[PDB]
Amino acid sequence: KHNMKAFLDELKAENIKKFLYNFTQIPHLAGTEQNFQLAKQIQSQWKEFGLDSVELAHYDVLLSYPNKTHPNYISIINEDGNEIFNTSLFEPPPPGYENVSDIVPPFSAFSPQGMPEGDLVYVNYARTEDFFKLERDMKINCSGKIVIARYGKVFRGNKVKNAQLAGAKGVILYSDPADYFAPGVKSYPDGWNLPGGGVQRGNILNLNGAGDPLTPGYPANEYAYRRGIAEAVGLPSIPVHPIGYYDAQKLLEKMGGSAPPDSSWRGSLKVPYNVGPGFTGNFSTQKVKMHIHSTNEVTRIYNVIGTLRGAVEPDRYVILGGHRDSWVFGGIDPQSGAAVVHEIVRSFGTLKKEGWRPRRTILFASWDAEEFGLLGSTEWAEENSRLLQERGVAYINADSSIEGNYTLRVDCTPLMYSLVHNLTKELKSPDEGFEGKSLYESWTKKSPSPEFSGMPRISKLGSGNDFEVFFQRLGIASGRARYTKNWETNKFSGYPLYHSVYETYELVEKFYDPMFKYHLTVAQVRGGMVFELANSIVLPFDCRDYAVVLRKYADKIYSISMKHPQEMKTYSVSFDSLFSAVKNFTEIASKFSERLQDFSNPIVLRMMNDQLMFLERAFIDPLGLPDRPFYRHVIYAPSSHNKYAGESFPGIYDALFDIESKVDPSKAWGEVKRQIYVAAFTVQAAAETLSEVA
Amino acid sequence: KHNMKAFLDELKAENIKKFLYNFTQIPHLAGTEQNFQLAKQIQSQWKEFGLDSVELAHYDVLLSYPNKTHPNYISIINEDGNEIFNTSLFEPPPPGYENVSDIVPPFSAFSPQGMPEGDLVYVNYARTEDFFKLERDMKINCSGKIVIARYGKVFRGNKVKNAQLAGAKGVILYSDPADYFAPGVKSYPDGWNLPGGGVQRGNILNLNGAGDPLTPGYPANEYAYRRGIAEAVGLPSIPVHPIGYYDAQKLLEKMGGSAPPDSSWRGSLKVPYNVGPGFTGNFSTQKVKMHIHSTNEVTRIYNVIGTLRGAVEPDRYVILGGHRDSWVFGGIDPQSGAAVVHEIVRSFGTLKKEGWRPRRTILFASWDAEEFGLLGSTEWAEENSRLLQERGVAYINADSSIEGNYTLRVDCTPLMYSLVHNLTKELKSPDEGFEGKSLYESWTKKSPSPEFSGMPRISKLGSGNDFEVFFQRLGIASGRARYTKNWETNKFSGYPLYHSVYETYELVEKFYDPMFKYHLTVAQVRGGMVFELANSIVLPFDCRDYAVVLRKYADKIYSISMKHPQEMKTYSVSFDSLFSAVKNFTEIASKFSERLQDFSNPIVLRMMNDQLMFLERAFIDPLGLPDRPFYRHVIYAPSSHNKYAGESFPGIYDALFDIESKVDPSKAWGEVKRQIYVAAFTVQAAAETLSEVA
Numbered sequence A, B: 001k002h003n004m005k006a007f008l009d010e011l012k013a014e015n016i017k018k019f020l021y022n023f024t025q026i027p028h029l030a031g032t033e034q035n036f037q038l039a040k041q042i043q044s045q046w047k048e049f050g051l052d053s054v055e056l057a058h059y060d061v062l063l064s065y066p067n068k069t070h071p072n073y074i075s076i077i078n079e080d081g082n083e084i085f086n087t088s089l090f091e092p093p094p095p096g097y098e099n100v101s102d103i104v105p106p107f108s109a110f111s112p113q114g115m116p117e118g119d120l121v122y123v124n125y126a127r128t129e130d131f132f133k134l135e136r137d138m139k140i141n142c143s144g145k146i147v148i149a150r151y152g153k154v155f156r157g158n159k160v161k162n163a164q165l166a167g168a169k170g171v172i173l174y175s176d177p178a179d180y181f182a183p184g185v186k187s188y189p190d191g192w193n194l195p196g197g198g199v200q201r202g203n204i205l206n207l208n209g210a211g212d213p214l215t216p217g218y219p220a221n222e223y224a225y226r227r228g229i230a231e232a233v234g235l236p237s238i239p240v241h242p243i244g245y246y247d248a249q250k251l252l253e254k255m256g257g258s259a260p261p262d263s264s265w266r267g268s269l270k271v272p273y274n275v276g277p278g279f280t281g282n283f284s285t286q287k288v289k290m291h292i293h294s295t296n297e298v299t300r301i302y303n304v305i306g307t308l309r310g311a312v313e314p315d316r317y318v319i320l321g322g323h324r325d326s327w328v329f330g331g332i333d334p335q336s337g338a339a340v341v342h343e344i345v346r347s348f349g350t351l352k353k354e355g356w357r358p359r360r361t362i363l364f365a366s367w368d369a370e371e372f373g374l375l376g377s378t379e380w381a382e383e384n385s386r387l388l389q390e391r392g393v394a395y396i397n398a399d400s401s402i403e404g405n406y407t408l409r410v411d412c413t414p415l416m417y418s419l420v421h422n423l424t425k426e427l428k429s430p431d432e433g434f435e436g437k438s439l440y441e442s443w444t445k446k447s448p449s450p451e452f453s454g455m456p457r458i459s460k461l462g463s464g465n466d467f468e469v470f471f472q473r474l475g476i477a478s479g480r481a482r483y484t485k486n487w488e489t490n491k492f493s494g495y496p497l498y499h500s501v502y503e504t505y506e507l508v509e510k511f512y513d514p515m516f517k518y519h520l521t522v523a524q525v526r527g528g529m530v531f532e533l534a535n536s537i538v539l540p541f542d543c544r545d546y547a548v549v550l551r552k553y554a555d556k557i558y559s560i561s562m563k564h565p566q567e568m569k570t571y572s573v574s575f576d577s578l579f580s581a582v583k584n585f586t587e588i589a590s591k592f593s594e595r596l597q598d599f600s601n602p603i604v605l606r607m608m609n610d611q612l613m614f615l616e617r618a619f620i621d622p623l624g625l626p627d628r629p630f631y632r633h634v635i636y637a638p639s640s641h642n643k644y645a646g647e648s649f650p651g652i653y654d655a656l657f658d659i660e661s662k663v664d665p666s667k668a669w670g671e672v673k674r675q676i677y678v679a680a681f682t683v684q685a686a687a688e689t690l691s692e693v694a
């Protein structure tokens, strides 16, 4: 039989291991020859694996690179202008890679050039609330200062935007051992911790879903009209550079001015964590000087797009996509995900060679330039937006398969919750102590949902990966899954070696997943989801799950507003319309579900499958959210304070945020009421797509 | 048999006549009780005719009405402030209607209040080029002047925007006999010409597709958040009022200052048509004073929505819609169209009672508040936009059925050209001299297309009617048809009694269509189109017709640009990408057509029908045109100079318009290039929707 079990049994840990080794021997930085060569390799292998068509889709997009002959670094300079301390020019390469060339040195992609000199201010994680504390409570002014911020908690681009709005003239980002060194584990190569010379690369754009900075809304093709750099979307206006904690300790240890306001501002280095500005008495005439000489350059990138044509509904697309470009070797990010995709294509291709085809078309994508702002997936989606919005069933992302070895992690639209529960009950747990038990059982035990015992946690999607254009711009049901750490016992962020030269094949094979069993489990989950979405007669979406979450989110945003009861009375701010819409959605979804379970008629089937497919689409508002036109989903958007986190009812949440500080409360509360109307209208409109059609 | 011929034979001229008489005995102004009563009547009759469901959809939208106890008028005032001449307070009512109450006096809907006094400037038709001639050539300054403009040539709202941008402090609109009095015909009630006391009502908004001024983007429902008047969309900022030519002659005859620049500025009154400003010597101390006291008021409106559920594809909608609200009795506009709709519903309902249903759902709409800015159709479309964009097959409008008795007039998307040619060849000509000949034959003979002998003219859609939201915002294939005048021998605009109290049942029955044969023919065309769209197995759209027109429009916009060959060299302005896209569309459309003619498979059928339905949809750009976010179609938009006229490649056309006058040519030509890229990308993207799907 050609069924899901055939598909799943064909997947092999040993193949994932071979592919991961093959993908991680040299760097594959976006825009470089090595990454184009890997694109061509994947294209060739996907054809040989059996796909119907495999093409490269290229675009010319703005990328950013250091200057090879004028390196970036930071100094402490004395009053004569002598540079008495310089930060490292590169991370010490790991064992056996000390002769690899083309390792890009640490830098903040898209930083402008500059050599600002000034006094330091330490701003903790540079979150909105850290700047509130400095400015409103401590009365410290960042204007014209260089800010030093520890990485962690929020996306680094939000940190830079926050520093820029505080008036900083430069930003220094560093990895504190508090956030990137797990107690009792050794530094690489002897364990999976970040050494003191390790540094996290990463872009600092604030694109808000735009894709290539020069061509928002349209693909960066051969004839595209490009904005000038001055009108580009999302570029920072002050220089930024990241460093490791050996160098950070040298910059922090001399800090004077005010003490940290409390312990949540103190990391683990043996320094006071004084906020500044500037250095203590003896060193008060020294300054910090940045030297940034990176250049932005329009550069060609290549996505690989593989198609497995559907047998019955070839005009319905189920997409499995993840990126191929890496900062250096990409041992976890992205190649542990790309190796899994490669083995999924291989298994579907084995069935295809035996005469099978899925019911719907499956598209497989190896995206480029994800690390520079989701550029490859976004430009391809801009090019293909009309096909995707009328034909796109679902998008499953496939970046890193592992960021720990403790339990499963899934983030997805509520429409896929039931599919995920059902699939995980049919899969074997790879965990020690749960041999013979389902993945659902081990996941639920290790990661209980806050809401319902006997259920596992499933998070909302935010952003910071290639599902963003599909979900938040286009309204295509999306999901992602990976193995993760124990979040209770682990206070570090992501994994310690994230975006460092130390993320290697050896890291994964020695410390994370020697048997490749967690990779295999992730391949089964991602692949199983794609198989069900592409093969189930009725799409495997449950609209009743959206009804349950919408009520939860309406309760949550109502509770935020009710912190301001006098203003709600004064301005007549009512959530009645929103709860009415959610009640109506609940009722209509319940009736739709009964019809779905109660109808030999392929027109009623497909009519019903179209209602299921366009339900996520109904949450899109073609006018976008305020000042963020490419975030169009009214229920979910990336948080305005942290692109990685999803926010629910984002339009109302942002209208309420810090509202007690607004100088015109009438205007501010009017905008809250406007966002409640938009949300209530959209929920009701989405509900009505599920009503009988005529 | 239940076929198109059964449907068409059931239509009766005598029924259209009875319904027109019934709809035109009292005024049905939007927002008034009489119009709500007619809504309820139509709803009841449509149910009795056999529709499956007939509902009212109400909204609360901004309307505008004169003050019953403080009438609007214009005066000439002497230097003492004595009003020595006043314009009429009402049109003399026609015979037998002198006791009808609730006839709204002439006014410009949405005019602000004011009593400006000043010197007159005569501005011909107040078109963009008339203001160019006054300002650039004649050096006449309109700043702080009252402008008097003759109606005709362009939408009155464009006239007001133009006057407002010239700095006028008020606008007086009047009907010149040159444009509203056909030589050799008598004034009403003895003929169909406009008498000297007749006045054309009409709104002066510039909504650019927004619908209700207070709720752009969202339906004006029970909980809507409304903008304040100061932020309302499209309201004029200076007072405006319309008058007839008896009163206009009294305002013009004293005009001094400069002579008219040439004969195209002279109408038919016995006055010099001097441009002014102000009056000749003896009268030079007199001024003109307006008194406008109209009020804008949020007011409930009601659409009637009837559904005839499809037998096979109930989730595909073919919509026949036209408005019900009138300025006064609405003898032509809209009741000659609404009577036709009523008889179409009756005929479909007869077949339905005999057991028939159409293949797809047909929706029938009686829209409200069309006269105040397309408000009823736009608010309903805003409410239902998700259903319409995923399910909407086509929209056929049904405003006035006649504006002359000479020949057919059709304006529609190229996708319906073949359908219209085929249908008209099967219909009987009602014209004298063509008895026994097809409507296609008489239409082609009387209204040849400029492009191909043996073919009839079919115009592009612009705006100024209820198809606007469906076509230009949502991208649903749309069309309209009516009987019209001989345009060569007739130099007047629209029909003379347009929007006057004289548009009555007697006007139509005595002068336009005594036998109701032109109405019947129009019912056959509109109804026949709806029948084919709702019943053909394969949707009756020919994509190859779009390819032919796209080439014509690309040639046209290239020719405009080539008036500036030096700038095209300097700024490297190339149309190569656009012609490439059009060539590719031509090739792909040809291959799609062969597949369409060459495939028992209902999935391939519906897949192909979906490609046909979403082809018009593919021309939509979700970012809209510049500063006009609700005009989203890239091939067609209402002209920025005349809402009634369609413009092709509007984004490029407006970037090129008057470009030689722009102060920064680099910037201006860059915007041309940007619009060429947007257009070429959209044409290619639309073509690719017709490629094989996987």
Ligand SMILES: *[C@@H]1O[C@H](CO)[C@@H](O[C@@H]2O[C@H](CO)[C@@H](O[C@@H]3O[C@H](CO)[C@@H](O)[C@H](O[C@H]4O[C@H](CO)[C@@H](O)[C@H](O)[C@@H]4O)[C@@H]3O)[C@H](O)[C@H]2NC(C)=O)[C@H](O)[C@H]1NC(C)=O
Pocket: A577, A578, A580, A581, A584, A680, A681, A684, B222
């Ligand atoms: C959830 O679904 C329900 C349908 O089950 C839907 O209920 C609808 O609510 C609207 C808004 O309340 C109702 O609107 C009323 O409609 C009647 C005519 O049918 C009007 O006469 C009412 O207006 C009068 O009363 C108003 C309220 O006090 C006055 O402000 C106004 O000036 C008028 O005097 C009013 O417009 C509608 O009838 C029901 N529809 C039903 C029951 O089918 C509800 O709106 C949905 N929720 C959301 C968020 O959409």
Ligand SMILES: *[C@@H]1O[C@H](CO)[C@@H](O[C@@H]2O[C@H](CO)[C@@H](O[C@@H]3O[C@H](CO)[C@@H](O)[C@H](O[C@H]4O[C@H](CO)[C@@H](O)[C@H](O)[C@@H]4O)[C@@H]3O)[C@H](O)[C@H]2NC(C)=O)[C@H](O)[C@H]1NC(C)=O
Pocket: A222, B577, B578, B580, B581, B584, B680, B681, B684
């Ligand atoms: C109409 O349809 C045709 C397809 O039949 C489509 O043709 C495509 O044109 C693009 C743009 O010209 C071609 O792009 C080239 O692709 C190759 C790789 O396949 C690249 O190497 C080329 O780039 C090099 O050369 C450029 C041009 O001088 C340089 O600027 C650049 O730096 C590189 O050196 C170039 O990107 C594409 O191959 C074809 N596709 C085909 C033939 O399938 C055409 O684009 C369509 N029209 C529109 C308006 O979309």
Ligand SMILES: O=C(O)CC[C@H](NC(=O)N[C@@H](CCCCn1cc(COCCOCCNc2ccc([N+](=O)O)cc2[N+](=O)O)nn1)C(=O)O)C(=O)O
Pocket: A153, A154, A202, A203, A333, A370, A371, A372, A373, A374, A399, A400, A407, A408, A409, A411, A446, A447, A457, A459, A463, A464, A465, A484, A485, A486, A487, A488, A493, A494, A643, A644, A645
């Ligand atoms: O330009 C861009 O937008 C991104 C380009 C690039 N992209 C990435 O590098 N993306 C990485 C981002 C690495 C994430 C680092 N990170 C994660 C977070 C946390 O937010 C995640 C959302 O919460 C869901 C996790 N929830 C839990 C799951 C399990 C659990 N448990 O106890 O088993 C507990 C959980 N929990 O939240 O307590 N903060 N930082 C990726 O997506 O894999 C970049 O960010 O530089």
Ligand SMILES: O=C(O)CC[C@H](NC(=O)N[C@@H](CCCCn1cc(COCCOCCNc2ccc([N+](=O)O)cc2[N+](=O)O)nn1)C(=O)O)C(=O)O
Pocket: B153, B154, B202, B203, B333, B370, B371, B372, B373, B374, B399, B400, B407, B408, B409, B411, B446, B447, B457, B459, B463, B464, B465, B484, B485, B486, B487, B488, B493, B494, B643, B644, B645
């Ligand atoms: O708020 C709004 O947007 C509108 C609300 C209201 N709406 C209307 O009143 N709509 C009327 C508008 C009345 C039209 C008056 N008018 C028409 C025109 C001409 O533009 C029409 C586009 O050209 C197509 C006609 N082409 C020809 C057809 C036949 C023919 N022949 O020789 O047989 C020749 C043609 N031709 O162009 O030479 N200028 N003014 C309606 O749509 O019926 C209003 O305008 O105040």
Ligand SMILES: *[C@@H]1O[C@H](CO)[C@@H](O[C@@H]2O[C@H](CO)[C@@H](O)[C@H](O)[C@H]2NC(C)=O)[C@H](O)[C@H]1NC(C)=O
Pocket: A021, A022, A023, A025, A040, A041, A044, A045
């Ligand atoms: C990764 O695996 C690929 C595919 O097996 C290797 O590429 C092949 O190399 C052999 C020997 O050089 C060639 O004859 C084939 O033409 C290649 N196949 C391709 C590109 O599809 C590649 O050598 C491996 N890379 C590493 C670092 O092990």
Ligand SMILES: *[C@@H]1O[C@H](CO)[C@@H](O[C@@H]2O[C@H](CO)[C@@H](O)[C@H](O)[C@H]2NC(C)=O)[C@H](O)[C@H]1NC(C)=O
Pocket: A075, A081, A082, A083, A084, A085, A086
């Ligand atoms: C930090 O780096 C800078 C730049 O290379 C060093 O200063 C340079 O030193 C060389 C040789 O002494 C001089 O010729 C250049 O004039 C200096 N350039 C600048 C910009 O100062 C500095 O010596 C280094 N400091 C430490 C502690 O290593």
Ligand SMILES: *[C@@H]1O[C@H](CO)[C@@H](O[C@@H]2O[C@H](CO)[C@@H](O)[C@H](O)[C@H]2NC(C)=O)[C@H](O)[C@H]1NC(C)=O
Pocket: A418, A419, A422, A540, A541, A542, A597
């Ligand atoms: C998840 O599995 C459950 C349990 O099998 C499915 O729910 C059943 O679906 C069948 C088939 O329609 C119904 O007849 C049963 O009554 C359902 N049982 C319930 C709701 O407890 C559910 O459909 C699956 N979800 C998917 C595939 O998305």
Ligand SMILES: *[C@@H]1O[C@H](CO)[C@@H](O[C@@H]2O[C@H](CO)[C@@H](O)[C@H](O)[C@H]2NC(C)=O)[C@H](O)[C@H]1NC(C)=O
Pocket: B021, B022, B023, B025, B040, B041, B044, B045
């Ligand atoms: C227009 O026609 C309608 C429908 O025939 C007339 O309304 C009917 O009036 C009769 C007699 O008053 C009533 O008993 C019915 O209840 C009405 N039917 C409806 C409203 O559907 C109406 O009188 C006619 N109007 C004019 C001006 O002739």
Ligand SMILES: *[C@@H]1O[C@H](CO)[C@@H](O[C@@H]2O[C@H](CO)[C@@H](O)[C@H](O)[C@H]2NC(C)=O)[C@H](O)[C@H]1NC(C)=O
Pocket: B075, B081, B082, B083, B084, B085, B086
């Ligand atoms: C035009 O109308 C105005 C307004 O009604 C007339 O002026 C008014 O005349 C009455 C009676 O003579 C006075 O009591 C008011 O004071 C006047 N109002 C204003 C605003 O002037 C004027 O007489 C009329 N002119 C003509 C020629 O009929």
Ligand SMILES: *[C@@H]1O[C@H](CO)[C@@H](O[C@@H]2O[C@H](CO)[C@@H](O)[C@H](O)[C@H]2NC(C)=O)[C@H](O)[C@H]1NC(C)=O
Pocket: B418, B419, B422, B540, B541, B542, B597
């Ligand atoms: C308009 O009528 C023409 C002539 O009948 C139709 O064109 C024919 O369509 C049939 C059926 O597919 C083809 O086999 C013929 O070859 C076509 N003849 C031609 C192109 O000359 C055309 O499809 C009709 N258009 C509609 C209904 O939109």
Ligand SMILES: *[C@@H]1O[C@H](CO)[C@@H](O)[C@H](O)[C@H]1NC(C)=O
Pocket: A067, A068, A069, A070, A293, A295
């Ligand atoms: C890199 O090094 C120096 C900086 O001025 C110079 O030789 C060259 O222009 C730089 N390359 C760039 C800016 O791309």
Ligand SMILES: *[C@@H]1O[C@H](CO)[C@@H](O)[C@H](O)[C@H]1NC(C)=O
Pocket: A141, A142, A143, A144
């Ligand atoms: C911070 O310092 C700058 C530079 O001197 C000054 O212009 C700015 O207004 C100050 N702001 C506050 C809040 O102190």
Ligand SMILES: *[C@@H]1O[C@H](CO)[C@@H](O)[C@H](O)[C@H]1NC(C)=O
Pocket: A192, A404, A405, A485, A511, A512
């Ligand atoms: C792998 O699992 C073991 C067992 O709990 C754990 O102690 C170790 O920390 C894990 N490795 C990683 C990288 O998390």
Ligand SMILES: *[C@@H]1O[C@H](CO)[C@@H](O)[C@H](O)[C@H]1NC(C)=O
Pocket: B067, B068, B069, B070, B293, B295
């Ligand atoms: C109409 O007439 C006068 C104008 O001031 C006044 O009695 C009443 O307020 C007006 N009605 C309005 C403005 O709606």
Ligand SMILES: *[C@@H]1O[C@H](CO)[C@@H](O)[C@H](O)[C@H]1NC(C)=O
Pocket: B141, B142, B143, B144
């Ligand atoms: C027109 O007249 C006004 C008012 O005196 C003046 O402000 C304006 O600038 C003038 N413009 C031109 C072009 O003469």
Ligand SMILES: *[C@@H]1O[C@H](CO)[C@@H](O)[C@H](O)[C@H]1NC(C)=O
Pocket: B192, B404, B405, B485, B511, B512
């Ligand atoms: C109706 O037709 C006759 C015959 O040509 C024509 O002379 C008359 O002008 C027409 N009536 C109208 C209103 O156009």
